[PDB]
From a paper:
The antibiotic sinefungin (SFG) is a SAM analog in which the S-CH3 sulfonium moiety of SAM is replaced by a C-NH2 amine. Available evidence indicates that the antifungal activity of SFG is exerted via inhibition of fungal cap methyltransferase [name].
Here we co-crystallized KlAbd1Δ137 with 0.9 mM [name] and determined the structure using KlAbd1Δ137-SAH as a search model. The final model was refined at 1.33 Å resolution with Rwork/Rfree of 18.5/20.3. Electron densities for [name] were observed in both methyl acceptor sites. Additional electron densities were observed in the methyl donor sites, which were interpreted as the co-purified adenine moiety of the product SAH. The tertiary structure of [name]-bound KlAbd1Δ137 was virtually identical to that of SAH-bound KlAbd1Δ137 (r.m.s.d. of 0.4 Å over 287 Cα positions). The guanine moiety of [name] is buried in a deep pocket created by Phe247, Ala248, His250, Phe333, Ile339, and Phe412. The guanine-N1 and -N2 atoms make a bidentate hydrogen bond with the Glu344-Oε1 and Oε2. Guanine-O6 makes direct and water-mediated hydrogen bonds with Tyr251-OH. Guanine-N3 makes a hydrogen bond to Tyr413-OH.
Author numbering: 138 to 425
Write the structure that this text describes.
Amino acid sequence: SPIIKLRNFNNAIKYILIDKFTRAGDVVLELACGKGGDLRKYGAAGISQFIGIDISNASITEALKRYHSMKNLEYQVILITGDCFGESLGVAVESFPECRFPCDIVSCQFALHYAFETEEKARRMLLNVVKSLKIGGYFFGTIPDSEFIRYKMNKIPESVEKPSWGNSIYKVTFSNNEYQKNGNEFPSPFGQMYTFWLEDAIDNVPEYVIPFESFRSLADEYGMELELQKGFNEFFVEEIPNWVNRFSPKMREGLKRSDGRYGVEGVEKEPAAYFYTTFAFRKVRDYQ
Ligand SMILES: C[n+]1cn([C@@H]2O[C@H](COP(=O)(O)OP(=O)(O)OP(=O)(O)O)[C@@H](O)[C@H]2O)c2nc(N)[nH]c(=O)c21
Ligand SMILES: Nc1ncnc2[nH]cnc12
């Protein structure tokens, strides 16, 4: 089905992205780790310690359930309930002294846009990231692509009170049309809400635009410089020649198109390959 193909494609993107930035022995902090479904990806890269934090105790309880049911992994796994975006990370990790900070990489998958609810939250998130990371370390992940959002919004007339687009498996519905009223520009980079539906995945949940230019300029303020901004389509097209034979048999077959090449085709292509982008930054200097 389209949704199964989308999940496999996005899982492949995460495999490639994690492998790109993680090295053997690294300590990884995963913000908004949800139910902790990427442990095997980090294990393949040879990490020494995974620290996952999520605001939901139901999610962490599930992540712990899932972790405890695995095997004799070669790495330590720490799973913590805490708010990675709205509060100092020190709050969440005070009672987990086994964490080894500063860490080598910070990851955040399909979640960092929640930090753009307000400027205060965006900045608190970035301060948490840089305080956690070694100089030279990387911050990477996957977000909705503001540039694709802007393209779709630029095709919506101002008469539409709640700008919306979608297909048989996903939909985006903006809370307001202030973008269109303001000359096709958001009135603020923060708090620009839209509800997101994805079949059997996200149940019409409010989230916020993450305008990439603002993310990048704020990250620079906190000492992080851009490493990667490729949309999922371009990232996959560039990385697939080196990855076809590295994927598991099941993931490779899942990516196989009707023409014998790899990727997504059919209705999942827009939400899987255009709606999201990769990001990465490197911490190049200390922040006072
Ligand atoms: C958390 N989240 C997940 N997605 C999309 O949903 C897909 C699945 O999201 P996922 O891999 O985080 O969870 P899943 O339900 O697959 O696994 P489980 O938690 O282990 O049961 C992703 O590949 C994205 O397409 C998301 N899409 C958007 N726009 N916003 C989100 O907050 C978001
Ligand atoms: N602030 C937050 N911290 C951690 N996980 C989250 N998921 C959604 N918002 C979150």
